[PDB]
Design a protein around this ligand. Structure first.
Ligand SMILES: [Cl-]
Ligand code: NA
Length: 129
């Protein structure tokens, strides 16, 4: 599923991401934009052999199981395929764990490089939220 911008904002808000670990909704929408372009089916192989999955490009080295990432963990206790569903529940649940791991949203390198410090409120402009 390719979410609309405001569509994703509404879903993320409903699932409790707005101000989660102090990160405003715009931060989460911005992260999703540059991680997946709002596409739940997005997958991208990393140089270390892990793969990033879904709307927030959650990585198989620590967070989900894909059966092909050697020596990796599954801290969200989910198959990585579950992060590709139209329903973003699993991705949000797992993202909450990731953002709580110590480095906040810096865990998403695209957030650090493209969202951090910017006018992230722009990402929820016009949305009836
Ligand atoms: Cl933080
Ligand atoms: Na894994």
């Amino acid at each position: 599923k390719v979410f609309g911008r405001c569509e994703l904002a509404a879903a993320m808000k409903r699932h409790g991401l707005d101000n989660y670990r102090g990160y405003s909704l715009g931060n989460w929408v911005c992260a999703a934009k540059f991680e997946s372009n709002f596409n739940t089916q997005a997958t991208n192989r990393n140089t270390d052999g892990s793969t990033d999955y879904g709307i927030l490009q959650i990585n198989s080295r620590w967070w989900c199981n894909d059966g092909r990432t050697p020596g990796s963990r599954n801290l969200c206790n989910i198959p990585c395929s579950a992060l590709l569903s139209s329903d973003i529940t699993a991705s949000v649940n797992c993202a909450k764990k990731i953002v709580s791991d110590g480095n906040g949203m810096n865990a998403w390198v695209a957030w650090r490089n493209r969202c951090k410090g910017t006018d992230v409120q722009a990402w929820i402009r016009g949305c009836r939220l």
